[model samples]
Target: LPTVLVAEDHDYDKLILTEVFARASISADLRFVSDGEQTLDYIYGRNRFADRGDAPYPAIVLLDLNMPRLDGRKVVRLLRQDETVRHLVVIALSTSESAKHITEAYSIGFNAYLVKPANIADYVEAIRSLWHFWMNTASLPTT
Candidate 1:
């Protein structure tokens, strides 16, 4: 199964995302990091996640832009700069519809970007569509 790292700080949104993904039957092993710092630490094998066996790098990252302790833009910059994670797919999943954020995300090498869904039904449908396209139609790198 593909592994998905959801970098969202809000508890409610996290729960909702989990439900949406599950309902979509996305067979990914999902993990969550509450802040940008934790997201970076988890992805780059740092701090408590230093052990590779315990903290395998995620196949895809769903990043939120307004998180505390570094934020998604900074994480994107760091990941894009590092050779270790430069090729990993980072998809911005944020509420920010600003052109600035969108431009920065793509400039920082995010593979894709998605705006937040406002309701559970929409969230579920969106996740299902994403899973269908990514897991069924697209080709993924073999780790």
Candidate 2:
């Protein structure tokens, strides 16, 4: 099974995300980071994630645009620059409705951009669709 890295700050949001993953029936190990800086650290195998075996490359990254330190936009840009991690799937899961943000995120290298819904039901449906397409409908990268 593929691993999934989730970059989110809010505690309640994490709970909702956990629920979505459970509902989706995804068996992949889900790794969570509070901020963009921590996300980058996890991706680069720095700090607490120095062991590659424990912190394997994620097949998909669920990123939040608004975050402390590095932020998701910069993370996407940096990931695109790095040849090793460039092929990883990145999906923006943010509350921002601005067209500029959406357009910029896609331009930078986000495979998909999803606006986070307010209610749990809507959130579940959106996350379910994400897993459905990425895990079931599409042919994912082996590495």
Candidate 3:
């Protein structure tokens, strides 16, 4: 199973995302980091994440742009600058539909951007589609 690093601060959205992934039958080792700074720590193997066995690199990072203590934009910028992890796939999942947010995410190197679905059924379908296209059809780099 592929590993997914989820960087989201909101509890409700995190619950919804996990439920959606389960319903979609996406078999991935999902790791959660509540904020962008912690996500960076996971990526850089710092402090609590010093051991690779405990904190493995993920195949995909599902990020929320509004996170506190660094935010998704900063994370993307840093990740892109780091040669070791520059190729990792990053997908921005945000509630905002602002054109600026979407464009900025893409401009900073997010592989894809998705708006958070309000309803459960739609959320499940979106996750299913995401799994199909990214996990099944696309050639993802091994972490």
Candidate 4:
């Protein structure tokens, strides 16, 4: 199964996201990080994620725009700046939406931008589309 990293601060959102993935049959090894700093730690293999056994590198990252520290924008920027993880795919998983924000998110290096749907059916569909395109349709870098 593909490993996915999620950067979301809210517990309820994380639960719902997990449920949606389950319903969609994504079958991913999903890992959670509360804030921007923790996300960086996990990705960088530092601090709490120093040990690779406990914290395996994720193939994709689902990031929330607003966060306690650093925020998703800053996190993606840093990832792009670092050659080690620059090829990593980072998607913006958000509740709120706007043209400006979406544009900026892409400009900042987000692979895709997805908004949380209101109902479970829609949510499931979103995840299915995401999984299908990213995992099946597209070819990713081996490095």
Weakest ten-residue segment in model 2 by summed lDDT: 64-73
Candidate 2 local lDDT, 1-143, one digit each (tens):
67889887778877888887787666878898887778888888898989999889888888877655446767888989999878888888778999998998899899999998888788778877788888889987755
Deviation (Å) of 39 in candidate 4 = 0.5
Model 1, 81-133: lDDT tens per residue?
A: 88877777778887889999888788878898888889988988988888777
RMSD of each: 1.7, 1.6, 1.4, 1.4
Candidate 2: where are CA atoms >4 Å away? none
Q: How many backbone clashes does every candidate have?
A: 0, 0, 0, 0
| Residue 92 C-alpha lDDT in model 3 | 88
Give residue 101's lDDT in candidate 1 (0 to 100).
80
The residue ranges of model 1 lying beyond 4 angstroms of the native Cα positions read none
What tens-digit string does per-residue lDDT give for candidate 3 at 8-105?
77788778888888888778888888877788888888988999888888878888766665467778888899898899899988789999988988
TM-score-wise, the better of 2 and 3 is 3
Q: Indicate the worst ten consecutive residues by lDDT in candidate 1.
A: 65-74
Give candidate 4's root-mean-square deviation (CA, Å).
1.4
- For the record, the alpha-carbon RMSD of candidate 2 to the native fold, in angstroms, is 1.6
Whose TM-score is higher: candidate 1's or candidate 2's?
2
lDDT of 4 by residue, 1-143 (tens): 67799887688778888898899977889898888888889988999999988888888888876555547767888889999889999898776688888898899999999887888899899889988988899986654
lDDT values for all models: 0.80, 0.82, 0.85, 0.84
